[PDB]
Amino acid sequence: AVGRMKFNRSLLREEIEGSGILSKDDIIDVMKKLIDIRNGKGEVDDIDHL
Amino acid sequence: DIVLNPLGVPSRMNIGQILETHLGMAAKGIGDKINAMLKQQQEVAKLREF
Amino acid sequence: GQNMRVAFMPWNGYNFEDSILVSERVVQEDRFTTIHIQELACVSRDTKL
Amino acid sequence: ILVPRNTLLHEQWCDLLEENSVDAVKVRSVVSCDTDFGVCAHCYGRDLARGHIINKGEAIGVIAAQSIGEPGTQLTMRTFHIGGAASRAAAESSIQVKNKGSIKLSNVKSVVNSSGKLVITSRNTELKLIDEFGRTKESYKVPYGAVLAKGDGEQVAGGETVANWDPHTMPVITEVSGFVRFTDMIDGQTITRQTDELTGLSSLVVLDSAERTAGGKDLRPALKIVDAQGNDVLIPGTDMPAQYFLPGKAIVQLEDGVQISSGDTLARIPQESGGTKDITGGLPRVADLFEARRPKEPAILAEISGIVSFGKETKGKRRLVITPVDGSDPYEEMIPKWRQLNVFEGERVERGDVISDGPEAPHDILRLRGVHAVTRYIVNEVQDVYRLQGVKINDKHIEVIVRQMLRKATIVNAGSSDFLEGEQVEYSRVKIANRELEANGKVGATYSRDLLGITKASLATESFISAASFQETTRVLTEAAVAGKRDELRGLKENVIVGRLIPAGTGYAYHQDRMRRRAAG
Amino acid sequence: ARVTVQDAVEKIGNRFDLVLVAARRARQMQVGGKDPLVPEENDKTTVIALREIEEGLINNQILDVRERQEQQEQEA
Amino acid sequence: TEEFDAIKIALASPDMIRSWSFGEVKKPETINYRTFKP
Amino acid sequence: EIKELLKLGDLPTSGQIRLYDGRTGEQFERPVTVGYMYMLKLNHLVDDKMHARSTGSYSLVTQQPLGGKAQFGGQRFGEMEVWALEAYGAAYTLQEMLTVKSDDVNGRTKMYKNIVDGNHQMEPGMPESFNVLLKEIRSLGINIELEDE
Amino acid sequence: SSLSILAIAGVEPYQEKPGEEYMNEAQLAHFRRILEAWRNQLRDEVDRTVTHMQDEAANFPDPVDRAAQEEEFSLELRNRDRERKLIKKIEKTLKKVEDEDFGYCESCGVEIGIRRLEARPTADLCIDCKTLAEIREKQMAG
Amino acid sequence: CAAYNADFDGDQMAVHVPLTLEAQLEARALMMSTNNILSPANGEPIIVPSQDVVLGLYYMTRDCVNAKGEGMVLTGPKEAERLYRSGLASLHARVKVRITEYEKDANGELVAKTSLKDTTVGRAILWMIVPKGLPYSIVNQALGKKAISKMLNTCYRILGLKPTVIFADQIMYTGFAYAARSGASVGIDDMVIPEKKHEIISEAEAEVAEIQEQFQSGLVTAGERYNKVIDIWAAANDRVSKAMMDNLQTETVINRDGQEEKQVSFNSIYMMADSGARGSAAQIRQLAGMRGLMAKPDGSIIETPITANFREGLNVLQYFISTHGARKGLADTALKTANSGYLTRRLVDVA
Ligand SMILES: Nc1nc2c(ncn2[C@@H]2O[C@H](COP(=O)(O)OP(=O)(O)O)[C@@H](OP(=O)(O)OP(=O)(O)O)[C@H]2O)c(=O)[nH]1
Ligand SMILES: Nc1nc2c(ncn2[C@@H]2O[C@H](COP(=O)(O)OP(=O)(O)O)[C@@H](OP(=O)(O)OP(=O)(O)O)[C@H]2O)c(=O)[nH]1
Ligand SMILES: [Mg+2]
Numbered sequence A: 001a002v003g004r005m006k007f008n009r010s011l012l013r014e015e016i017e018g019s020g021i022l023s024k025d026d027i028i029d030v031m032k033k034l035i036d037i038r039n040g041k042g043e044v045d046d047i048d049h050l
Numbered sequence B: 001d002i003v004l005n006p007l008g009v010p011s012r013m014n015i016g017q018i019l020e021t022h023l024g025m026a027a028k029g030i031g032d033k034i035n036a037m038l039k040q041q042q043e044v045a046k047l048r049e050f
Numbered sequence C: 001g002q003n004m005r006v007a008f009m010p011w012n013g014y015n016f017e018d019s020i021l022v023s024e025r026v027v028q029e030d031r032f033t034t035i036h037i038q039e040l041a042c043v044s045r046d047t048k049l
Numbered sequence D: 001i002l003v004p005r006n007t008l009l010h011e012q013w014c015d016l017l018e019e020n021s022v023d024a025v026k027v028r029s030v031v032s033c034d035t036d037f038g039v040c041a042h043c044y045g046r047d048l049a050r051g052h053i054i055n056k057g058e059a060i061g062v063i064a065a066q067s068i069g070e071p072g073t074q075l076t077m078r079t080f081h082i083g084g085a086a087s088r089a090a091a092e093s094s095i096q097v098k099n100k101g102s103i104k105l106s107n108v109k110s111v112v113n114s115s116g117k118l119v120i121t122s123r124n125t126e127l128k129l130i131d132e133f134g135r136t137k138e139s140y141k142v143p144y145g146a147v148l149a150k151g152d153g154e155q156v157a158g159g160e161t162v163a164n165w166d167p168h169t170m171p172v173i174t175e176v177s178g179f180v181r182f183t184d185m186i187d188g189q190t191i192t193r194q195t196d197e198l199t200g201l202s203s204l205v206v207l208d209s210a211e212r213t214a215g216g217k218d219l220r221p222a223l224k225i226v227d228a229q230g231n232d233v234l235i236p237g238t239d240m241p242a243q244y245f246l247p248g249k250a251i252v253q254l255e256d257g258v259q260i261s262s263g264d265t266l267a268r269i270p271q272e273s274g275g276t277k278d279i280t281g282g283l284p285r286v287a288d289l290f291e292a293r294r295p296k297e298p299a300i301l302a303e304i305s306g307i308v309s310f311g312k313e314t315k316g317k318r319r320l321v322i323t324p325v326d327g328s329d330p331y332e333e334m335i336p337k338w339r340q341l342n343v344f345e346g347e348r349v350e351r352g353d354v355i356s357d358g359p360e361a362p363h364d365i366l367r368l369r370g371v372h373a374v375t376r377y378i379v380n381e382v383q384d385v386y387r388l389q390g391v392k393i394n395d396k397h398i399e400v401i402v403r404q405m406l407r408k409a410t411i412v413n414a415g416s417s418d419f420l421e422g423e424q425v426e427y428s429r430v431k432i433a434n435r436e437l438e439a440n441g442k443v444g445a446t447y448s449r450d451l452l453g454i455t456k457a458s459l460a461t462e463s464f465i466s467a468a469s470f471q472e473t474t475r476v477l478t479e480a481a482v483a484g485k486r487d488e489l490r491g492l493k494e495n496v497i498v499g500r501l502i503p504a505g506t507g508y509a510y511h512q513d514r515m516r517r518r519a520a521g
Numbered sequence E: 001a002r003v004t005v006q007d008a009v010e011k012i013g014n015r016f017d018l019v020l021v022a023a024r025r026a027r028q029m030q031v032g033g034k035d036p037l038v039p040e041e042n043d044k045t046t047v048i049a050l051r052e053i054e055e056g057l058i059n060n061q062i063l064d065v066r067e068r069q070e071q072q073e074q075e076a
Numbered sequence F: 001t002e003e004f005d006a007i008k009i010a011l012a013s014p015d016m017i018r019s020w021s022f023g024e025v026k027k028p029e030t031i032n033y034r035t036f037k038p
Numbered sequence G: 001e002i003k004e005l006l007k008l009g010d011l012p013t014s015g016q017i018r019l020y021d022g023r024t025g026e027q028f029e030r031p032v033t034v035g036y037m038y039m040l041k042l043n044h045l046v047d048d049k050m051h052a053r054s055t056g057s058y059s060l061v062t063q064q065p066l067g068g069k070a071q072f073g074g075q076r077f078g079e080m081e082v083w084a085l086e087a088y089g090a091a092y093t094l095q096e097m098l099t100v101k102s103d104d105v106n107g108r109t110k111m112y113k114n115i116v117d118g119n120h121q122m123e124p125g126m127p128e129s130f131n132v133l134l135k136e137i138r139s140l141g142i143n144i145e146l147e148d149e
Numbered sequence H: 001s002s003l004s005i006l007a008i009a010g011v012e013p014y015q016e017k018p019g020e021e022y023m024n025e026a027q028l029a030h031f032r033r034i035l036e037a038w039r040n041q042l043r044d045e046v047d048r049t050v051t052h053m054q055d056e057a058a059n060f061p062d063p064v065d066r067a068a069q070e071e072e073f074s075l076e077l078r079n080r081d082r083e084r085k086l087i088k089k090i091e092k093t094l095k096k097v098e099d100e101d102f103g104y105c106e107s108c109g110v111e112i113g114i115r116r117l118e119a120r121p122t123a124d125l126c127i128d129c130k131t132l133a134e135i136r137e138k139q140m141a142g
Numbered sequence I: 001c002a003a004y005n006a007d008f009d010g011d012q013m014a015v016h017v018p019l020t021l022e023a024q025l026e027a028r029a030l031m032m033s034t035n036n037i038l039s040p041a042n043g044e045p046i047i048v049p050s051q052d053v054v055l056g057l058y059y060m061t062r063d064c065v066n067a068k069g070e071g072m073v074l075t076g077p078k079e080a081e082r083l084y085r086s087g088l089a090s091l092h093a094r095v096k097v098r099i100t101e102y103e104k105d106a107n108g109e110l111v112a113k114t115s116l117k118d119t120t121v122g123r124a125i126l127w128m129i130v131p132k133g134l135p136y137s138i139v140n141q142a143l144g145k146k147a148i149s150k151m152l153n154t155c156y157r158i159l160g161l162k163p164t165v166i167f168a169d170q171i172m173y174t175g176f177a178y179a180a181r182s183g184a185s186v187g188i189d190d191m192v193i194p195e196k197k198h199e200i201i202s203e204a205e206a207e208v209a210e211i212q213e214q215f216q217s218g219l220v221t222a223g224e225r226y227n228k229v230i231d232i233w234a235a236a237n238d239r240v241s242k243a244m245m246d247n248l249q250t251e252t253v254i255n256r257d258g259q260e261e262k263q264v265s266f267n268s269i270y271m272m273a274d275s276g277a278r279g280s281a282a283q284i285r286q287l288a289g290m291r292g293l294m295a296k297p298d299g300s301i302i303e304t305p306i307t308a309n310f311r312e313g314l315n316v317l318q319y320f321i322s323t324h325g326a327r328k329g330l331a332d333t334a335l336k337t338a339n340s341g342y343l344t345r346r347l348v349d350v351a
């Protein structure tokens, strides 16, 4: 539930609780956001955060 | 009781121990003053007031 | 721990470095005497002899 | 004579040497010491916990390593690039004499101009200052093309400007007189007409192959210095007719038809050369300096002497051909475009002069300039780092290390070896002494020194038990097992491993005795 | 001379075979083949041998010459 | 105790390997578990 | 606030008082800071740290002396210490330290007897670790023999 | 106020005259003086730093005060590095002034204000292009 | 201790016993402490006084405008010492003393020159120790860390080892003695906040206000603002530091018989600084001045400084930033030492 919460928060979705397994829409949105950040419409995250 | 080397203060930038020494000397001064007023057994009133 | 009367000054280089000089008065009163409870075990096994 | 041949210089000798004004002293160094399998007491000297000359037997190697290792914690763990270089030359144009002394020129050949100034056409010129009693107070480096005011010998008062030149400008200087004749100096083919009005200004750009049209690829535009009669007048004292190959952007002020006096600037060529020596320091720079890592884009030097010239144009590396006047011509070296060149085509360079600006790789220094030059360079370069933090070390230790780095040579001649094998300099030197003392040459054999970074040098150890002690054990054990190599131990760490007497110090006598007992009756 | 061995190094300049000479002498003293040549100050034989070396009474030449002398005497 | 020097390294030939060895170790057993004799 | 409270105690507001040297009786120049500070006795007690060993138990495979406190211990000269000794011309101390003191069995016993008898000689032998090394490399197909000339 | 960049030199803010042309001899000389003073000051500060660094450095026996004495040096060297990076920019600006090509934006030919040049004498671009480039940079970086 | 890099805070040492007779000799001859006083790196002495000694000597030799026994003429150093120990004169007070120095002028002969020098009581008492061969000039001066080391060095160069060892021991004993008699300590009021701190701070803040105003005008993007502010803050920091040190050093305005004068103060912390026993100007700054600008993790320098000092009290943010800097340094030290060891080992392997 935490993993899903963080995953949906990173992709700006209102929905908090998901199904554990990766729906393929997830992967597609992931690649969309990756190419977005590669274009420059986003900030890179640091793994230092608390 | 203890004789401490002064050359440890300025290069070790921990100056808090010096203020600690001062405030502690003042606290024991109060304690002495109360011990003195009790050894003479002045009166409840005077000890209470002080 | 405990609170002692300290004086900041060099006393014939016995506190040369971070070392500390202490007066017999503290040991006399036994105010830094610790109790340590150590355990010892003697085990008697059975050898083939 | 105030100091007889090799004497140990103790404090009092130094005091006597100071009261006089001796400037330079040849001192025997450990690097050049001649004895094989160790060093000689004298070349090393005294300096130790005791006062005296080194006693035979002391392990100087580990002493030096210890002394160079103990410090290195005052130094910061990064590579701070303060790069300030506080004490500059106050400006870039004029020189400023600090103390009143005689002016003395080193390594130059000047050309008196029409006003009568010694315009210097030498790249390696220095201008020192002699003091009252014969010593070098001030020393300055004057670049190529700087007009002077006072020449050589005359006394300069305190704070007099003795030299002047435009920084961002490398002048082309004519040595003889007569009319300027244009060669291949066609309008459109080799130059681009950007012309001013009456006073005769131009912005002519000598275009390289790319910007020159399809016909002007090989056309070398030149400025011939001819006389009234026609024949090419020769530079004073030399037979070369001065054919100044005008490089790119040679702004020819004096057009064709103006009698140039001997020493007038031919054409302004702009060069925005960096004028600051960024200081570098801290620990890792030291490790890298001691590991002899090929630096970044290295500066280049000349290999043999002789008049330089260009070669096949613009293939991605412009050619430089050094042709020796006497020896064979054929040394062409390709060079990348981004390198800036210091010498004109029609110039006579010497071997190991600077050709490009930047950092020199110690390997080149050793190969061209030789041993003492590389050792001095290393010593000074590290010592600068160590003094930057204020840790004092005597040079002798760094010197022993440098000697350990040069342990190896490579044979180019023949006669007893494999003609190409990297071989220790000691075996080569003993075999050369043998051959040359015997009747037969064989051939030979000529060698060249090579410089190794302390790690590789360590890896090139002879005895295999040490190398197995600190190297990848499997590799050394395998190679030595196949080679059938035989270890006499000869070293310190070997004997430690076997638990017998190290050959250093108190035990040297023991081993010395054994050496005499071996190979005896 | 258990402070500075400077005078022994002034006698023997190697500063290493010094310790070997002193060891030979002090072992010649320990196994009681000989007796001390200097009045002892309740010292052990190490500093005794150093004291003998520093005054020029004993060195390598005196050890070898006197040793072969005593040897040839003991031959009879 | 010998006075030696020069330590030599070479591939061991099979006859040398037989030379050093005193016997062939045929079975993997170690000890009797009852009496711990080998 | 400290100044105020010190005044309430009737003590010098600067917090320094003149002290007399208890040995001679002379006063100290420049009064010195005195006062109470809270100190702690840490668990690092000299009673535990002190340790010495003459002779004791040795290890099974590599005949070195055991390291530690339960077993007497026996510090350890490392390469850095070796280098230090090599820096001097100190060959005999290094030699004993390397063989007679740890790994040479016969040497160590003979030296025990010599010391007890009041003689000081030595007999270095071969360090046991080196013998183990020979046997371990020989276990491979690598012939390592001590040659003679 | 004696704390800006005009303070380093003994110069007070210029004042373009009514019919004063843009780049005249006097303005160029002014800016050269300013830059030269700034530089010489920075280099003298580097000399101070180095003398300090050379005097202080010592071997401390406590690991929690060697870090104390090597955590102020890191900051000091940081500032010195930054100013060294600015010495190359000042050098380049001094080259543009000597070349008489100073005061105009490198992207668009518009001339950069005199008051901005008295503000940050090393300015290479106009405020508009500067802002756009800074945004593009910060966006392509993160 | 300097040779061992040892400090008495629970550091431990090992003790080995050389067994054979030859080992005993090698230890006593080559390895003995007294034989190795010169550093193998450079020729200079290693055993120089460290911290407490230097403080004692600095106090003992330092001169003062006015005290007890100004202008007394003493027949010799022993009488000087008799005067000090009886309390008829301060341990430092300007005085005319007769002293007999010896000179190695001839071929190793000592020639006594005996005349009247103008020195301190303390300097004579110290001159008692000095062995014969040294010129008086050596001790006549302030006698700090540098000067004391040079003193020892010259003693070595002229006489030789034996006397230098004895002179070093004597120096230690005397330094400890007179350091104890001085009674120097460190009180809260000994670290004086310069009167003009807040003035310079207000000026720097006014300048930041002006730079903000010139930002709102649109002459500078944010980057120029950041850089410019950081530079003005650095300059303000250095100026305040220098002003505090000026206040601190020469503030003892002591008076002679009539009019007054000013001199190198006897502020305990200042003497502890200047003698070279502990501390440098930077640390004194951080106690009594503003502890400058600080850096965040990434190497970027935070724009706003602390402005507080340890005599005063810091606040949450300021302490947090100081944590950044401190812990960064603390984590770097370990790695640095562990890699310097490796460098030294691969440098010993080659040679
Ligand atoms: N560091 C130091 N050493 C001092 C001092 N005063 C005396 N010594 C030295 O200590 C040694 C004194 O030892 P002894 O007097 O013989 O008495 P002992 O039986 O305890 O050894 C002497 O050196 P020695 O071993 O006897 O040398 P040598 O004269 O025999 O050659 C002496 O020079 C001092 O103040 N400081
Ligand atoms: N003391 C000082 N240094 C200056 C100043 N201006 C620029 N620098 C330093 O020189 C570097 C060069 O900056 P630029 O790349 O030219 O960027 P810019 O046009 O905004 O100045 C700066 O990079 P930087 O990225 O800002 O450095 P940093 O942030 O990585 O530490 C900075 O470190 C200045 O006015 N004063
Ligand atoms: Mg410690």
Ligand SMILES: [Zn+2]
Pocket (backbone or CB within 6 Å): D033, D034, D035, D039, D040, D041, D042, D043, D044
């Ligand atoms: Zn030699």
Ligand SMILES: [Zn+2]
Pocket (backbone or CB within 6 Å): H105, H106, H107, H108, H109, H110, H125, H126, H128, H129, H130
């Ligand atoms: Zn623009």
